[PDB]
Design an enzyme around this catalytic site. Structure first.
Site, short mmCIF file in Angstrom:
data_model
loop_
_atom_site.label_atom_id
_atom_site.label_comp_id
_atom_site.label_asym_id
_atom_site.label_seq_id
_atom_site.Cartn_x
_atom_site.Cartn_y
_atom_site.Cartn_z
N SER A 44 0.79 -1.25 0.00
CA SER A 44 0.00 0.00 0.00
C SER A 44 0.81 1.28 0.00
O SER A 44 0.22 2.36 -0.12
CB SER A 44 -1.08 0.05 1.11
OG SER A 44 -2.16 -0.82 0.74
N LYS A 47 0.39 3.71 -2.75
CA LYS A 47 -0.82 4.58 -2.78
C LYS A 47 -0.40 6.07 -2.78
O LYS A 47 -1.13 6.93 -3.29
CB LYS A 47 -1.78 4.26 -1.62
CG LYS A 47 -2.60 3.05 -1.87
CD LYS A 47 -3.35 2.68 -0.60
CE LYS A 47 -4.46 1.71 -0.90
NZ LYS A 47 -4.01 0.33 -0.98
N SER A 104 -6.01 3.20 3.96
CA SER A 104 -5.45 2.18 3.07
C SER A 104 -6.52 1.41 2.26
O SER A 104 -6.43 0.20 2.07
CB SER A 104 -4.55 1.22 3.87
OG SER A 104 -3.56 0.69 2.99
N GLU A 140 -5.12 -3.33 -7.25
CA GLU A 140 -5.44 -3.97 -5.97
C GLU A 140 -6.42 -5.10 -6.22
O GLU A 140 -7.35 -4.90 -7.00
CB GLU A 140 -6.13 -2.94 -5.03
CG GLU A 140 -5.20 -1.81 -4.53
CD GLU A 140 -4.11 -2.31 -3.59
OE1 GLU A 140 -3.29 -1.48 -3.15
OE2 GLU A 140 -4.07 -3.53 -3.27
N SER A 211 0.93 -3.48 3.87
CA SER A 211 1.13 -4.87 4.25
C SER A 211 0.75 -5.77 3.07
O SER A 211 -0.01 -5.37 2.17
CB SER A 211 0.29 -5.19 5.48
OG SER A 211 -1.08 -5.16 5.14
O1 LIG Z 1 -2.18 -3.75 3.89
C1 LIG Z 1 -2.85 -2.70 3.78
O2 LIG Z 1 -2.31 -1.56 3.88
C2 LIG Z 1 -4.35 -2.82 3.58
C3 LIG Z 1 -4.71 -2.59 2.11
C4 LIG Z 1 -5.00 -3.96 2.73
C5 LIG Z 1 -4.22 -5.02 1.95
O3 LIG Z 1 -4.59 -5.32 0.81
N1 LIG Z 1 -3.19 -5.65 2.53
C6 LIG Z 1 -2.85 -6.95 2.38
C7 LIG Z 1 -2.91 -7.66 1.17
C8 LIG Z 1 -2.52 -9.01 1.12
F1 LIG Z 1 -2.59 -9.69 -0.04
C9 LIG Z 1 -2.06 -9.67 2.27
C10 LIG Z 1 -1.98 -9.02 3.49
C11 LIG Z 1 -2.36 -7.67 3.58
F2 LIG Z 1 -2.27 -7.03 4.75
#
Ligand SMILES: O=C(O)[C@H]1C[C@H]1C(=O)Nc1cc(F)ccc1F
Ligand SMILES: O=C(O)[C@H]1C[C@@H]1C(=O)Nc1cc(F)ccc1F
Ligand SMILES: O=C(O)[C@H]1C[C@H]1C(=O)Nc1cc(F)ccc1F
Length: 262
Positions: A44, A47, A104, A140, A211
């Protein structure tokens, strides 16, 4: 290698993963780097580039940020804290940018990507501001697969620090736009356990976390201490196991090591 690098390496060894750090001190413009030229999955943190690029557009399209964008049920992806509140309604490009940065929100980010003509359009902005390292390849949520060795959707700690500096402290954006970005980052809701947790409590910071899979745990921040020039700090962290848990504490500790090393 310095003391700070020795402590970062020890932290990295304790964690079981791979750590990337870049600090730019705007006082003398010196840099502290740890794996500063290795690629890491942005997750993220990308972004910030998408939001900045829409900000750039608005310097000519003066009311762009106020434009309503439909949120459709088919738009919604895996994590939409804000956009799910406006399904069968509309949110503005300002509200979308805020939601992406501050919560996020992945559906928000996908709207920003669409506004730029795809992941190539976000990468176009990076190139337009001199960042030749950033690449955004997917939308995403697939951009977060964070597969070891995969070059897609990666940047280096050195490049992202230099970019974040230009965007929030430099003049890659118009003044109105920069100030909007700084405001947005200062009001992030997702960062309290990350870089911010390692910093003297009287510092102001704005940040964007990220993440993903492989326990990928990221934060990028602009920091304003008191009576010294602002800093930009990037802390990226990723792990060998696909289902590894998040380690925001590693980022907090990297930032404590840097904060002590100043
Ligand atoms: O992680 C973030 O900032 C928020 C946006 C959410 C996201 O898609 N994260 C994410 C994606 C994934 F594929 C695995 C773990 C995660 F934490
Ligand atoms: O190798 C690179 O990353 C840079 C020279 C390639 C490049 O700028 N490509 C590129 C840039 C964009 F902004 C969008 C799509 C692209 F393929
Ligand atoms: O985009 C730029 O200005 C720098 C990366 C150099 C470049 O040739 N760009 C580029 C290359 C490509 F192959 C496709 C799109 C691009 F924008």
């Amino acid at each position: 290698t310095s003391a700070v690098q020795q402590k970062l390496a020890a932290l990295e060894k304790s964690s079981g993963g791979r750590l990337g750090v870049a600090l730019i001190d705007t006082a003398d413009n010196t840099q502290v780097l740890y794996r500063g030229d290795e690629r890491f999955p942005m997750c993220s943190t990308s972004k910030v580039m998408a939001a900045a690029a829409v900000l750039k557009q608005s310097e000519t399209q003066k009311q762009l940020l106020n434009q309503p964008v439909e949120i459709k049920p088919a738009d919604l992806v895996n994590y939409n804290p804000i956009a799910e509140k406006h399904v069968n309604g509309t949110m503005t490009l300002a509200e979308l940018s805020a939601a992406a940065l501050q919560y996020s929100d992945n559906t928000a980010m996908n709207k920003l990507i669409a506004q730029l003509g795809g992941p190539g359009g976000v990468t176009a902005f990076a190139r337009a501001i001199g960042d030749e390292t950033f690449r955004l390849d997917r939308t995403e949520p697939t951009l977060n697969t964070a597969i070891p060795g995969d070059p897609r959707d990666t940047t280096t700690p050195r490049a992202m620090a230099q970019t974040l500096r230009q965007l929030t402290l430099g003049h890659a954006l118009g003044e109105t736009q920069r100030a909007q970005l700084v405001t947005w980052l200062k009001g992030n809701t997702t960062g309290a356990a990350s870089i911010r947790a390692g910093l003297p409590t009287s510092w102001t910071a704005g940040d964007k976390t990220g993440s993903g899979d492989y326990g990928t745990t990221n934060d990028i921040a602009v920091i304003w201490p008191q009576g010294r020039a602002p800093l930009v700090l990037v802390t990226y962290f990723t792990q060998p196991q696909q289902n590894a848990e998040s380690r925001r504490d590693v980022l907090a500790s990297a930032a404590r090591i840097i904060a002590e090393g100043l």
